[PDB]
Amino acid sequence: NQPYRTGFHFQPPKNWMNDPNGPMIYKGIYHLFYQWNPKGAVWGNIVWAHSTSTDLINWDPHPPAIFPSAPFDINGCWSGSATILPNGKPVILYTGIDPKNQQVQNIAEPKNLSDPYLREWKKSPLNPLMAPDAVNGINASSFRDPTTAWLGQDKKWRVIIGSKIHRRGLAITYTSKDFLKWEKSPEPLHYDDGSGMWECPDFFPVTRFGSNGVETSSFGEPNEILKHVLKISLADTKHDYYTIGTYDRVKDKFVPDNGFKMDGTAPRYDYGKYYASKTFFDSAKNRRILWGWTNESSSVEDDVEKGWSGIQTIPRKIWLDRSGKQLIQWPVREVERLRTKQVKNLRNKVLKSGSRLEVYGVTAAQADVEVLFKVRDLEKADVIEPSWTDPQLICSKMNVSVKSGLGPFGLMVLASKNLEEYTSVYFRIFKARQNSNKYVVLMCSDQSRSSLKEDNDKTTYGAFVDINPHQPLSLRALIDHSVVESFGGKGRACITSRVYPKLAIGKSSHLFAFNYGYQSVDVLNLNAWSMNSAQ
Ligand SMILES: *[C@@H]1O[C@H](CO)[C@@H](O[C@@H]2O[C@H](CO)[C@@H](O[C@@H]3O[C@H](CO[C@H]4O[C@H](CO)[C@@H](O)[C@H](O)[C@@H]4O)[C@@H](O)[C@H](O[C@H]4O[C@H](CO)[C@@H](O)[C@H](O)[C@@H]4O[C@H]4O[C@H](CO)[C@@H](O)[C@H](O)[C@@H]4O)[C@@H]3O)[C@H](O)[C@H]2NC(C)=O)[C@H](O)[C@H]1NC(C)=O
Ligand SMILES: *[C@@H]1O[C@H](CO)[C@@H](O[C@@H]2O[C@H](CO)[C@@H](O)[C@H](O)[C@H]2NC(C)=O)[C@H](O)[C@H]1NC(C)=O
Ligand SMILES: OC[C@H]1O[C@@](CO)(O[C@H]2O[C@H](CO)[C@@H](O)[C@H](O)[C@H]2O)[C@@H](O)[C@@H]1O
Ligand SMILES: *[C@@H]1O[C@H](CO)[C@@H](O)[C@H](O)[C@H]1NC(C)=O
Ligand code: NA
Ligand SMILES: [Zn+2]
Ligand SMILES: [Zn+2]
Ligand SMILES: [Zn+2]
Ligand SMILES: [Zn+2]
């Protein structure tokens, strides 16, 4: 019996899953590889597992693609990325562990380029293409995760590798004119002092105005103003951060926009349980897709007990916000195909102070729900306390029991009949400590009351949303048994959490809208779809 296995998120039939690997589209087929343990529910014996799709939702298995079978990767096949060469040919750059336990960079390419599912991959010699040594002095124990490579205006390829030198994180950048002979640049594309190791780095352009994706090597088209994103997975904090800036192709550096620092004080893709993010360019739809690894919030005991660990968020479409300050994400449209044609709809319903509204007629552990909340009188929101800068510390300081002028209001997902178990995703609104009348919208994902099992990770997640509370506040949540993916302000803030209820399972879960704030807020619209299982 498996109450926590997802009905429609990507996870292997069994065992431990980890980083998403070399995602790509080839011959109109979507590919996903991933770090897999073929014989355990913990990390180990790590190989590139492999599934394919035509819609990014239903995945067909294939035997592992990249596994230890040569000096350059004999002690493991760590993370990496697929580049698609200008002639449509796809290649994987991945980190392998050698006889000396050194992290080195290997190329792998398909052996049958006419196989539409690219089942078997051949590797060099002359692998490794990139390795630490005495001359470059790269930390052999911290040199992993090559990105998708991009082609410069000087016919030379660039690729970065996450690394660190003495508690300074950097994107070690290599150049190559043939994709076979790679040479280290004197200086990295970017670095941050005091940040740890830089894992799973990503580097890609975005249009300044538009929802569409940009091919990874593009400079034009003239005219069209581009912006560049550098994303890192910060090993110490265990979060993925990105910064928006410009790519000086002359110096071959990355320059973060004024109002950013790549270490710590940066925006996250996701303010909950989300790690080792990776994007690819979906040439089929001209969109950039972001893959993300949500690991397990239960005990390791539980993981080995259920015999699997780790899921993948449903893929996000990602693009720049109009104001240029952050990225927007939104679950790929395809996932909406999983919705039943029946749809529970509630409109213009008032939530008085301290109220809640059950929403029936849905499979409440496997569902998609979208709400529009309208605030009646913004002059009623409490002025935000002076030293409240961390949105995670606000949500954890004040639970749904503590009441604000406006908020807490939102959804209670994965909830038991009598509410002993519930996961609350919600908003609070404040007036800011500014001379201009600006409001601060808080999004929380509180899971302290989430499950009766006590040794689950009940960490509460939190985020600010850049939306105007004059217009109605939008909240979506994908609910899938042991995962909720909350989206605030139409993708302006995303929180993934992991939840393991003992009561709120299958038949026995709701599903509430609620409001415990001082002022009564209006539910403008509520759509709830039951969700069919994938694959
Ligand atoms: C893969 O999966 C695992 C598990 O899900 C995950 O590790 C967990 O990460 C979370 C954070 O994401 C950790 O949550 C913290 O837990 C500590 C306590 O943990 C200790 O004790 C437990 C045993 O019960 C052990 O598991 C663990 O090893 C530790 O010894 C909390 O204290 C933290 O809460 C504080 O900080 C939060 C903000 O970050 C606030 O929300 C909260 O209010 C707390 O602040 C309080 O103390 C502050 C002083 O430090 C003070 O400023 C405040 O006033 C306040 O009182 C936090 O909940 C969790 O412990 C991890 N668990 C394990 C098993 O390691 C991995 O990260 C994940 N990996 C990936 C790649 O995603
Ligand atoms: C090279 O990287 C390795 C691995 O991160 C470093 O050795 C680790 O340092 C940490 C933190 O001080 C300690 O837990 C251990 O001493 C090592 N742990 C691991 C995970 O191996 C080493 O310090 C780095 N050296 C340089 C020159 O950057
Ligand atoms: O599977 C290895 C792959 O995962 C990452 C990030 O998730 O590193 C994790 O696994 C390593 C193997 O034990 C650890 O050294 C590291 O601390 C952990 O975050 C990638 O860096 C790596 O390619
Ligand atoms: C490669 O793919 C083609 C087309 O699917 C297939 O017919 C062929 O047998 C495969 N292998 C070789 C060695 O050509
Ligand atoms: Na889409
Ligand atoms: Zn040194
Ligand atoms: Zn943190
Ligand atoms: Zn920086
Ligand atoms: Zn006003």
Side-chain angles (χ1 to χ4, degrees), residues 90-109:
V91 294
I92 284 166
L93 283 178
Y94 77 93
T95 296
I97 316 293
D98 67 22
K100 288 187 183 282
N101 275 305
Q102 301 199 132
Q103 280 151 28
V104 299
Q105 315 322 313
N106 299 319
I107 189 165
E109 52 176 36

Short mmCIF file of all heavy atoms in Angstrom, two decimals, residues 90-109:
data_model
loop_
_atom_site.label_atom_id
_atom_site.label_comp_id
_atom_site.label_asym_id
_atom_site.label_seq_id
_atom_site.Cartn_x
_atom_site.Cartn_y
_atom_site.Cartn_z
N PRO A 90 22.23 15.81 -30.69
CA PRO A 90 22.31 16.04 -29.25
C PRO A 90 23.48 15.33 -28.56
O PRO A 90 23.78 14.18 -28.88
CB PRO A 90 20.98 15.47 -28.74
CG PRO A 90 20.55 14.46 -29.79
CD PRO A 90 21.44 14.61 -31.00
N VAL A 91 24.14 16.02 -27.64
CA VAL A 91 25.20 15.41 -26.82
C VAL A 91 24.99 15.68 -25.34
O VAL A 91 24.39 16.68 -24.97
CB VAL A 91 26.63 15.89 -27.21
CG1 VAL A 91 27.00 15.42 -28.62
CG2 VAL A 91 26.77 17.41 -27.05
N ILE A 92 25.50 14.79 -24.50
CA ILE A 92 25.47 15.00 -23.06
C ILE A 92 26.87 15.26 -22.50
O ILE A 92 27.80 14.51 -22.77
CB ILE A 92 24.82 13.80 -22.34
CG1 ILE A 92 23.30 13.84 -22.53
CG2 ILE A 92 25.18 13.81 -20.86
CD1 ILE A 92 22.57 12.56 -22.15
N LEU A 93 27.01 16.35 -21.75
CA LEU A 93 28.17 16.56 -20.91
C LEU A 93 27.79 16.20 -19.48
O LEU A 93 26.84 16.77 -18.93
CB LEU A 93 28.66 17.99 -20.99
CG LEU A 93 29.45 18.40 -22.22
CD1 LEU A 93 29.78 19.87 -22.12
CD2 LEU A 93 30.72 17.57 -22.35
N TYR A 94 28.51 15.26 -18.88
CA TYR A 94 28.23 14.82 -17.52
C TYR A 94 29.49 14.66 -16.67
O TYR A 94 30.59 14.47 -17.20
CB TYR A 94 27.44 13.50 -17.53
CG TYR A 94 28.26 12.27 -17.85
CD1 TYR A 94 28.83 11.50 -16.82
CD2 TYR A 94 28.45 11.85 -19.16
CE1 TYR A 94 29.57 10.36 -17.10
CE2 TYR A 94 29.19 10.70 -19.46
CZ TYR A 94 29.75 9.96 -18.42
OH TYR A 94 30.49 8.83 -18.72
N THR A 95 29.31 14.73 -15.36
CA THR A 95 30.39 14.57 -14.40
C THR A 95 30.55 13.10 -14.05
O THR A 95 29.59 12.44 -13.65
CB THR A 95 30.12 15.39 -13.11
OG1 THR A 95 30.08 16.79 -13.42
CG2 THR A 95 31.19 15.13 -12.07
N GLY A 96 31.77 12.58 -14.22
CA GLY A 96 32.07 11.21 -13.82
C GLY A 96 33.09 11.17 -12.70
O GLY A 96 33.87 12.12 -12.54
N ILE A 97 33.08 10.09 -11.92
CA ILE A 97 34.06 9.89 -10.85
C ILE A 97 35.09 8.83 -11.25
O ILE A 97 34.74 7.67 -11.49
CB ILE A 97 33.39 9.50 -9.49
CG1 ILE A 97 32.15 10.36 -9.20
CG2 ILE A 97 34.40 9.55 -8.35
CD1 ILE A 97 32.42 11.84 -8.92
N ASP A 98 36.36 9.22 -11.31
CA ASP A 98 37.44 8.34 -11.78
C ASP A 98 38.09 7.48 -10.68
O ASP A 98 37.73 7.63 -9.50
CB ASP A 98 38.49 9.14 -12.58
CG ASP A 98 39.28 10.13 -11.74
OD1 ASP A 98 39.35 9.99 -10.50
OD2 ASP A 98 39.84 11.07 -12.33
N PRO A 99 39.01 6.56 -11.06
CA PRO A 99 39.78 5.76 -10.10
C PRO A 99 40.38 6.55 -8.92
O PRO A 99 40.59 5.97 -7.85
CB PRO A 99 40.91 5.17 -10.96
CG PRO A 99 40.79 5.83 -12.32
CD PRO A 99 39.37 6.19 -12.44
N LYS A 100 40.65 7.84 -9.12
CA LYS A 100 41.23 8.71 -8.08
C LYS A 100 40.17 9.49 -7.28
O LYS A 100 40.51 10.42 -6.53
CB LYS A 100 42.23 9.70 -8.70
CG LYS A 100 43.57 9.12 -9.17
CD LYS A 100 44.52 10.25 -9.60
CE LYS A 100 45.86 9.72 -10.15
NZ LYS A 100 46.81 9.28 -9.08
N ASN A 101 38.89 9.13 -7.45
CA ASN A 101 37.75 9.86 -6.87
C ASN A 101 37.64 11.33 -7.27
O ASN A 101 37.14 12.16 -6.50
CB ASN A 101 37.68 9.70 -5.34
CG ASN A 101 36.94 8.44 -4.93
OD1 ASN A 101 35.80 8.20 -5.33
ND2 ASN A 101 37.61 7.61 -4.13
N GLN A 102 38.08 11.64 -8.48
CA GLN A 102 38.07 13.00 -8.97
C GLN A 102 36.83 13.25 -9.82
O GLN A 102 36.40 12.39 -10.58
CB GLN A 102 39.33 13.28 -9.78
CG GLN A 102 40.62 13.08 -9.00
CD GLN A 102 41.80 13.79 -9.63
OE1 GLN A 102 42.56 14.50 -8.96
NE2 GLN A 102 41.98 13.60 -10.94
N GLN A 103 36.25 14.44 -9.65
CA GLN A 103 35.12 14.86 -10.46
C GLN A 103 35.63 15.42 -11.78
O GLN A 103 36.35 16.41 -11.81
CB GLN A 103 34.29 15.89 -9.71
CG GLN A 103 33.34 15.29 -8.69
CD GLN A 103 33.07 16.21 -7.52
OE1 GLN A 103 33.12 17.44 -7.65
NE2 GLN A 103 32.77 15.62 -6.36
N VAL A 104 35.27 14.75 -12.87
CA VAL A 104 35.76 15.11 -14.20
C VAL A 104 34.62 15.20 -15.21
O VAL A 104 33.54 14.62 -15.02
CB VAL A 104 36.87 14.14 -14.70
CG1 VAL A 104 38.07 14.16 -13.76
CG2 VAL A 104 36.32 12.73 -14.86
N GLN A 105 34.85 15.93 -16.30
CA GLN A 105 33.79 16.19 -17.26
C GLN A 105 33.92 15.32 -18.50
O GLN A 105 34.95 15.33 -19.18
CB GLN A 105 33.70 17.68 -17.61
CG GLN A 105 33.79 18.65 -16.41
CD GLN A 105 33.05 18.15 -15.17
OE1 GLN A 105 31.91 17.70 -15.24
NE2 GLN A 105 33.72 18.23 -14.03
N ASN A 106 32.86 14.56 -18.77
CA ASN A 106 32.82 13.60 -19.87
C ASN A 106 31.75 13.98 -20.87
O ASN A 106 30.68 14.46 -20.49
CB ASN A 106 32.49 12.20 -19.34
CG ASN A 106 33.52 11.67 -18.35
OD1 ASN A 106 34.72 11.83 -18.54
ND2 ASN A 106 33.04 11.01 -17.32
N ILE A 107 32.04 13.73 -22.15
CA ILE A 107 31.02 13.82 -23.20
C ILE A 107 30.47 12.42 -23.50
O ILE A 107 31.20 11.43 -23.45
CB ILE A 107 31.54 14.51 -24.50
CG1 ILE A 107 30.39 14.77 -25.48
CG2 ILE A 107 32.63 13.68 -25.16
CD1 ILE A 107 30.71 15.75 -26.59
N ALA A 108 29.17 12.36 -23.77
CA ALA A 108 28.52 11.16 -24.28
C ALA A 108 27.59 11.57 -25.41
O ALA A 108 26.95 12.62 -25.36
CB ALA A 108 27.75 10.45 -23.17
N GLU A 109 27.53 10.74 -26.45
CA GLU A 109 26.65 10.98 -27.59
C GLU A 109 25.93 9.70 -28.01
O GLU A 109 26.41 8.60 -27.69
CB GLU A 109 27.41 11.62 -28.76
CG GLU A 109 28.68 10.88 -29.21
CD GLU A 109 29.32 11.52 -30.45
OE1 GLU A 109 29.30 12.76 -30.56
OE2 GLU A 109 29.85 10.77 -31.30
#
